[PDB]
Amino acid sequence: MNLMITLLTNFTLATLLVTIAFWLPQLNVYSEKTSPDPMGSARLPFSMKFFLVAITFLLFDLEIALLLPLPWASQTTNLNTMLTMALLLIFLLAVSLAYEWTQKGLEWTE
Amino acid sequence: MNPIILIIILMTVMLGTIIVMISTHWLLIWIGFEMNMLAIIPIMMKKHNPRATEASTKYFLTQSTASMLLMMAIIINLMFSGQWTVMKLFNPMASMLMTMALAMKLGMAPFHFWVPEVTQGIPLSSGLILLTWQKLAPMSVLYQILPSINLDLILTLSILSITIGGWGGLNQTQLRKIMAYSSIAHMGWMTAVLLYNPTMTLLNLIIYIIMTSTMFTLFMANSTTTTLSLSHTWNKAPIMTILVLITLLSMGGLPPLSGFMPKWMIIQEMTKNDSIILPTLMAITALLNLYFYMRLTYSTALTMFPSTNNMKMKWQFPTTKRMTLLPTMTVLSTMLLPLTPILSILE
Amino acid sequence: KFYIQEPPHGSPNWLKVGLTLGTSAFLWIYLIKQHNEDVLEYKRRNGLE
Amino acid sequence: LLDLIWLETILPKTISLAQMKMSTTITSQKGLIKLYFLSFLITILISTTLLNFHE
Amino acid sequence: LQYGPLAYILGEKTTKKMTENSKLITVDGNICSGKSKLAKEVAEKLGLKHFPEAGIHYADSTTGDGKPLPVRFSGNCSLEKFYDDPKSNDGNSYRLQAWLYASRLLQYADALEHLLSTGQGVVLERSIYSDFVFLEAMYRQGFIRKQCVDHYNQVKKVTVCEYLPPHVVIYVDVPVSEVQSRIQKKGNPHEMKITSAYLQDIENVYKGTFLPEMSEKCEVLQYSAWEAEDAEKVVEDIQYLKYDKGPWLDQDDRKLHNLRMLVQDKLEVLNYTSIPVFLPEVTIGAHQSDRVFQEFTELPGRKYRAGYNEDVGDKWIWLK
Amino acid sequence: MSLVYMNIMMAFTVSLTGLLMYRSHLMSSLLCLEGMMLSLFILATLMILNSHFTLASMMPIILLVFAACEAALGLSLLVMVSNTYGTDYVQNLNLLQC
Amino acid sequence: MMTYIVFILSIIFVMGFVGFSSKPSPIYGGLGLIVSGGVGCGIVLNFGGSFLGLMVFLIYLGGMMVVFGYTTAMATENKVVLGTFITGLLMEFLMVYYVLKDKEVEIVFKFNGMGDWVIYDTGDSGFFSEEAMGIAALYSYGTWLVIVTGWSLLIGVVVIMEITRGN
Amino acid sequence: MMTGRQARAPLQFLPDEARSLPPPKLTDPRLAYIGFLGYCSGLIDNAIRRRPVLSAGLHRQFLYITSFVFVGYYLLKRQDYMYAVRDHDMFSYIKSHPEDFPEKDKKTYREVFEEFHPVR
Amino acid sequence: ARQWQPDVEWAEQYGGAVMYPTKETAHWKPPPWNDVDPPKSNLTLNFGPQGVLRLVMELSG
Ligand SMILES: CCCCCCCCCCCCCCCCCC(=O)OC[C@H](COP(=O)(O)OCCN)OC(=O)CCCCCCCCCCCCCCCCC
Numbered sequence A: 001m002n003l004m005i006t007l008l009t010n011f012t013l014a015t016l017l018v019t020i021a022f023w024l025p026q027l028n029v030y031s032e033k034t035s036p037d038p039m040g041s042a043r044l045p046f047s048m049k050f051f052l053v054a055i056t057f058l059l060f061d062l063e064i065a066l067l068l069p070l071p072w073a074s075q076t077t078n079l080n081t082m083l084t085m086a087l088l089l090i091f092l093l094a095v096s097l098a099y100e101w102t103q104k105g106l107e108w109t110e
Numbered sequence B: 001m002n003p004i005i006l007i008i009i010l011m012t013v014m015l016g017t018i019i020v021m022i023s024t025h026w027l028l029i030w031i032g033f034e035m036n037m038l039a040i041i042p043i044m045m046k047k048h049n050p051r052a053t054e055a056s057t058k059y060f061l062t063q064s065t066a067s068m069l070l071m072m073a074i075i076i077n078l079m080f081s082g083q084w085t086v087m088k089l090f091n092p093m094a095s096m097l098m099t100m101a102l103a104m105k106l107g108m109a110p111f112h113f114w115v116p117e118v119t120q121g122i123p124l125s126s127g128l129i130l131l132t133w134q135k136l137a138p139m140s141v142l143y144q145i146l147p148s149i150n151l152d153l154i155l156t157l158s159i160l161s162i163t164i165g166g167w168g169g170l171n172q173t174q175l176r177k178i179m180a181y182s183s184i185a186h187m188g189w190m191t192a193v194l195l196y197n198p199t200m201t202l203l204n205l206i207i208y209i210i211m212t213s214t215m216f217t218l219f220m221a222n223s224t225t226t227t228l229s230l231s232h233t234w235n236k237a238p239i240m241t242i243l244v245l246i247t248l249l250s251m252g253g254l255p256p257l258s259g260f261m262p263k264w265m266i267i268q269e270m271t272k273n274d275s276i277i278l279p280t281l282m283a284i285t286a287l288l289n290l291y292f293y294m295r296l297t298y299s300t301a302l303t304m305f306p307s308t309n310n311m312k313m314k315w316q317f318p319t320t321k322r323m324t325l326l327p328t329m330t331v332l333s334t335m336l337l338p339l340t341p342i343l344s345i346l347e
Numbered sequence C: 001k002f003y004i005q006e007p008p009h010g011s012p013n014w015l016k017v018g019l020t021l022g023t024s025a026f027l028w029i030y031l032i033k034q035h036n037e038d039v040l041e042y043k044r045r046n047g048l049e
Numbered sequence D: 001l002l003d004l005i006w007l008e009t010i011l012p013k014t015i016s017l018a019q020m021k022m023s024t025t026i027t028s029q030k031g032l033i034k035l036y037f038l039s040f041l042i043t044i045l046i047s048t049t050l051l052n053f054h055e
Numbered sequence E: 001l002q003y004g005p006l007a008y009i010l011g012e013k014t015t016k017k018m019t020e021n022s023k024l025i026t027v028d029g030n031i032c033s034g035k036s037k038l039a040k041e042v043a044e045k046l047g048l049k050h051f052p053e054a055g056i057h058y059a060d061s062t063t064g065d066g067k068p069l070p071v072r073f074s075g076n077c078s079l080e081k082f083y084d085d086p087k088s089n090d091g092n093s094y095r096l097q098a099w100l101y102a103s104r105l106l107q108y109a110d111a112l113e114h115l116l117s118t119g120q121g122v123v124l125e126r127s128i129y130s131d132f133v134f135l136e137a138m139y140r141q142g143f144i145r146k147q148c149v150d151h152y153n154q155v156k157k158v159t160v161c162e163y164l165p166p167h168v169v170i171y172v173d174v175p176v177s178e179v180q181s182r183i184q185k186k187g188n189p190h191e192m193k194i195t196s197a198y199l200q201d202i203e204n205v206y207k208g209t210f211l212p213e214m215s216e217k218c219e220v221l222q223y224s225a226w227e228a229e230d231a232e233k234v235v236e237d238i239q240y241l242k243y244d245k246g247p248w249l250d251q252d253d254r255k256l257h258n259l260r261m262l263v264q265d266k267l268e269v270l271n272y273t274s275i276p277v278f279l280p281e282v283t284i285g286a287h288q289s290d291r292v293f294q295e296f297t298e299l300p301g302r303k304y305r306a307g308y309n310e311d312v313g314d315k316w317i318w319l320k
Numbered sequence F: 001m002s003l004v005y006m007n008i009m010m011a012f013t014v015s016l017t018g019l020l021m022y023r024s025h026l027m028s029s030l031l032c033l034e035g036m037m038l039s040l041f042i043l044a045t046l047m048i049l050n051s052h053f054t055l056a057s058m059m060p061i062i063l064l065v066f067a068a069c070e071a072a073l074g075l076s077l078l079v080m081v082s083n084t085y086g087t088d089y090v091q092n093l094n095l096l097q098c
Numbered sequence G: 001m002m003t004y005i006v007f008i009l010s011i012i013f014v015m016g017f018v019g020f021s022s023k024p025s026p027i028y029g030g031l032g033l034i035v036s037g038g039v040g041c042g043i044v045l046n047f048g049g050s051f052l053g054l055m056v057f058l059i060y061l062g063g064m065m066v067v068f069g070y071t072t073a074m075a076t077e078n079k080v081v082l083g084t085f086i087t088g089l090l091m092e093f094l095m096v097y098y099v100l101k102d103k104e105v106e107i108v109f110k111f112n113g114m115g116d117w118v119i120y121d122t123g124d125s126g127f128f129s130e131e132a133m134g135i136a137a138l139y140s141y142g143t144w145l146v147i148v149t150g151w152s153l154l155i156g157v158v159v160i161m162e163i164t165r166g167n
Numbered sequence H: 001m002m003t004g005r006q007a008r009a010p011l012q013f014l015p016d017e018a019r020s021l022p023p024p025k026l027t028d029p030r031l032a033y034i035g036f037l038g039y040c041s042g043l044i045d046n047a048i049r050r051r052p053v054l055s056a057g058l059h060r061q062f063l064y065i066t067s068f069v070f071v072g073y074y075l076l077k078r079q080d081y082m083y084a085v086r087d088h089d090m091f092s093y094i095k096s097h098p099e100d101f102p103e104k105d106k107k108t109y110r111e112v113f114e115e116f117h118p119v120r
Numbered sequence I: 001a002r003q004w005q006p007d008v009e010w011a012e013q014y015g016g017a018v019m020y021p022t023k024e025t026a027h028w029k030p031p032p033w034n035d036v037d038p039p040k041s042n043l044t045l046n047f048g049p050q051g052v053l054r055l056v057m058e059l060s061g
C-alpha cells in the first residue's frame, strides 16, 4: 500500500508538472503567426531492417525470460539436471545468435 | 529455402504432432499445437508470392484463435478439476470450448471457411502436408477426450461439415478446393462415428490419408491445378488419368473401392446404436461428392479433351520427379475392400 | 551406340539391383524363420506335438 | 408426354437442378475474411444461446 | 536422380565452380545480321561453349538418337511454309512461333544447366529475352491475330519470371538494306520471299524495346556490322567489364540451387508453355494427337523410357 | 466461483468478439489476439497462485513465451502483407476466392 | 472498497479491453492494451505473484508490446468505436449492478458476489515464496518443458529469418 | 473400443500372449491377396514411368511382392490377435455375468404359434 | 462416323474458376498458372542550411 501511494505521488507530481509546463506559457500573450524536414511530403519508407532488429530483440527477450529464474534455480537438490538445462538454454541462445549471424540476418544493423 | 533448414523444419512439424500424441499434460498438448503451427508456416511460404502470404495469414489467424480457445478450455478444466491429465473434461463448458477449438483446427464446419483459401494459396506438397499430417493431432485429442464431448454438438458439427463439404465441391474447377471440400466432408464422417466406435474414426483417418496422399502425389506428378489442366494429362501420360479416375471414384465411396470401406463401416456402427436417420442423411449427402467426382472423371479420363502442339515435345521427356510411393498409395487406395477386417489392428 | 546422350538407365546400377535382390531374399528368409519360430512356439505353449 | 418428359423430370431432374442451385449458393461466397469471421461469431452466439448445446 | 537436394546437402555447392569466366553472353541481331560465326569465334576466344540456334528440331537434337525427327512428331510446322504463306489459313505462323519459343526455352534451360552444373559459360543466339521481336513483327504484319499475342505473353508471364537475364548482350547494327542484300546472297528461295516491313518491324521492336528493356537489367553492347568482323576486340571489350547490373550480384548458393533444381527438370521448364488455352491455331485434336502419340510409341527408341527399349537393344532390362 | 474469474473471462470474451469482427486492420486482429493471451495469463496465474499448486507456477511463463513467439510470427506475416499491399487492410486479402 | 481492490482492478481491466477491442486504430489499440496489461499485472500482484507480474512488465509490456508499437508506428503512418464502447460498458455495468444487488450472478458458471479475499489460506510458507520455488523447479524438474520450449524458440528464430527474407 | 485392455501393455504390436495363437499360414488367401497387391504395385510402377510393364524390374516387382507379403503377415497376426482378444473378453464377461445372459427355454415349434398368413 | 471425343466447347466448360457462374460470383478472373501474382522506390531528402550547404540526397534506405 506504500507502493501504490508512492506510485500515485510520482504520477501525480509528473502530471502536475506536465500541466504546469503546458499551461504556464499560455498565460503569455505574445502574438500569432503563419507557421507554414529533410523529406518534404513523401510517404514514410518502411524499413525492413528496423523490423528485423525488433523481432530479433523479441526472440532474445523470450530466451532471457526462460533464463531469468537461474538465481533461484541454483538452490536445488538436483544440480546436475539444473546445470545441464541452464547451459543448454544459454547454448540455444548462442545458436540463435549464430544462426542469426551466419545466414545473413544482422545486415545494416550489424 | 535451405534443404537442411527444410529438413529441420519438417522434423519440427513432425515433432509437434508427436508431442501432441504422446503427452499426458494439457500444456504439452498446447505446446505441440504451437510447435506445429510455428514450423508449418514457412512450408506454406516456400514460394514467396502474395497468395502464400495471404494463405499463411488466414491459416495463422484461424489456428491462433483455435489455440487461444484451446488454452481457455484447458484453464477452465484447471478450475473444475485442479489437474492437468489429458482425459475426459470435468466441465460441460470446457468440453464445448475444446470441441470448438478442435473444430477450428480440423477445419470442420461452421469453422471451415479457411480450408479452401489456404489450400488454394499454398503449393501442392504443402497442401498435402496440410490435408494429411495436420489432421493427425486434433483427431488424437478428440480420441482422448470423447467421454466428455457433447453428443449433439459433435453430431451437429459432423452433419453440417458433410453437407457444406458436399454441396460446395460440385461447382469447383480448382483441384485443391475440391480436395479441401473433400477434407471438410471426410472430417464430418470421422467425427460422426467418434462417440460410437472410434476405431472406425481411425480407419477413416488412414483411408483418407492414403487417398489424399495419392491424389496430391498425382497432382505433383503432372503439375495440375485446375480441372482442365488435369484433363490435358491423357496425351502427356495416359496412365495418370486412369489413376485419378479410380482414386477420385474412391474418395466419394464407390463400391467396391476402398473409399467405400470407411463410410460403410460408419453406417455399420451407427445403426448398431439405433441411429438409422443420421447415417441415412449422411449417405444421402455423400452422393453429391460422388457426383462431382463423376463430373471430374468425365472431364479427365473417359473422354479426351483436345490438346495443343506443344504436348508433342513433352512426349519426349519422361517425368523426372520423385513419385514417392505413388504405385503403393494407388494400390492401397483402390483395391483394399477385400481386406476390410484389417480394421481391428487399430483397436 | 544409339542414344545421343548416355541415358540415366543405360547400364544397371549394380549397387541398387544387389540391394533389391539381397533385401528381398533377406525378407523371405527372415519371414520363414519367424514363421517356424511361431509354429514351434505355438506347439510349445499348447503342447501339440 | 410421360416417358420422355414427366417421368424423366420427377425423379432425376428436380434433384439435379436443386443440387445445382444449392451448389451455387454454398459457393456463392465473396471470399472476404470479415464475412467468414463474422459468421464464426454468429456461430458461437447461436451455439451458446439458440441451441442449448452447452447443456 | 543424379542431382537432387541430397547433392546440395553432401557439399556440391554452385559457387565453387562459379568463377569469373562463367559469364552468360547473348549475341543478337536481325535475320541477316551475320552473327553465327561471331558467336563461334567469341566462344573459341573466351573459353565458352557454343550452342547452335534452336529451330524445329532442337528437342530432337537433345533427345533420343539426336537426328531431326519427322515433322508430325516434332514441330507440325515449318519456316518455309511461313515464308510462302505468312497469312496462312490454318494458323501455322503462331504454331511455328510457339514451337520456336518452346525450343528457345529448352535451349536457355540447357544454357543455365550447363552454366550451373559445369561452370562453363554459354554464348547464346537469340535467347528467350529476344523472341517476342519476331512475334510483334508477325502481328504488325497482320500475319497473326491479337489472341495469339496474348497467349504468348501469358506464357512469357508464367515462364520468364523464374529465370535470370544474361550478363552481356551484344547487338549487331545491320540495316535492312544489307539484310535484304544477304537474303539475295544466301540462295534459299523461301528466305528470298520476305518483304521489307517485316524486317523493319523486327528492327523497330529491337531498337525500341529489347535494348531499352535490357540496358538496365543487364550489360548491353551495341556494335555495327564491320567492327564485329574482328572478334578479338569484342573479347577485349568483354574482359574489361564492371558488373553492377542484373540480379547476378545478389545470388547465394541457395538461389542458384533453386535455379539449378528448376532448369534440369525439363517438364517443369516446359510446363506452362502449353497452358490449357484453346487457341485453334495450335489446337491438335484428340484423334490426331492419339494417332501421332501411338506412332510415337512405334518409333525406335521412343516406346519406353530410354534405357528400356527393345527395338534399339537395351540390355539388362529385367535387372532394371 | 470467484467473481474476478468472471471478469477475466468476460475480458477474454470481449477481446474474442473484437477479434471476430474485423474493421480494417490486421494489427487490430493481432492486438485482440494478444489481449486474449493476456487474459489467459491473468486467469491461469490467479488459479495457480490460489491453489498453491507449486509446479504449475512455471506454466504461465511458458504460456507467455510460446504465445509471444506466436505474436512475433504474426508480426512477420503482417509485415509481408504490408510489403505486398502497403497497408495492413483485410480487404486487400481477397485473392484466394477463385 | 479496499477489500474489493482486486475486483476494482478487474473492472478496470475489462473496461480497458472494451476500450481497445472496439478498435479505433492499432495505435490506440496498443495504448489501451498497455494500460490493460498494467492493471492486469496489478491483479496478479495482489495475490502474491510478484514474479509473474514482473514477467508481465518485463516481457509482455517490455518486449512484445514494444515491438507491436514499433511495427505499428512505422506501418500505418469513428461512430462504431464509440457505439461498441458504450454497448460493452453498459453490458459490464449491468453485470456490476447485478452482482452489487444480488451477491450472486450466473453468466455461464455460477459466481460469488463477495470480496475475493475469501478464497485464501491463513498459513506461512517459511523462508521461500511458493511461486518462486515453483518457477525455480523449471530447471530441476522441467527438463522436457525446457527442451520443447527452447527448441520452439530456436525454430522461431529460423522461421522468422526464412519468412522475412522475402525470397 | 478395446483400448482399456491394451493400455497396460502400451505400443506392443504383438504382445507375449499373441504367441499362444496359431499363426496365419503362408498359403493364406489374405496374404496371397496382399501379394497380388504387390504385383499390381509393380505393374502401376512400370506404367507410370513408361517401362515394359510385364518385363521390366522382375527384381523390382519381386521386391514389391516380398515387401507386401512381409508387412501383411505381421498385419494378419495383429488382426487375428485383436479378434481373439475380442472373443476372449466377451466370453470371460459372459462367464463373469451369468445373471445378465439368461438360458432361454428353447420352445419346440409345437408350442410356437406363428400366425399363418395366406397367399392367394 | 467414329467415337465422339469432345470438341473445344465441351472442354471450355471445365476451364473457368467455377463450373456454373452465378450473378454474384461473376467478377472472378482465373488465377495465374504458375500461382504467382504481380507484386503491385527510393527516398529523397532535401537538407536545408539549418558555411552553408544544401545537400539533396537520393537515398536507398
Ligand atoms: C492411427 C494412425 C496413426 C498414424 C499412422 C501414420 C500416418 C502417416 C501419414 C503420412 C502423411 C505424409 C504427408 C507428407 C509428409 C511430409 C513429406 C512431404 O510432403 O515432403 C515434401 C517434399 C518436398 O520436396 P521439395 O524439394 O520441396 O519439392 C517440391 C517441389 N520442388 O517432397 C515431395 O514433394 C516429394 C513428392 C512425393 C512425396 C510422397 C510422400 C508420401 C508419404 C505418405 C504415404 C502414405 C501415408 C502412409 C501410409 C498410411 C499411414 C496411415
Ligand SMILES: Nc1ncnc2c1ncn2[C@@H]1O[C@H](COP(=O)(O)O)[C@@H](O)[C@H]1O
Pocket: E030, E031, E032, E033, E034, E035, E036, E053, E055, E079, E097, E100, E134, E135, E138
Ligand atoms: N518469326 C520468324 N520469322 C523468321 N525467322 C525466324 C522467326 N523466328 C525465328 N526465326 C529464326 O531466325 C533465323 C534467322 O537467323 P539466321 O540464322 O541469321 O537466318 C531464321 O532462319 C529462323 O530459324
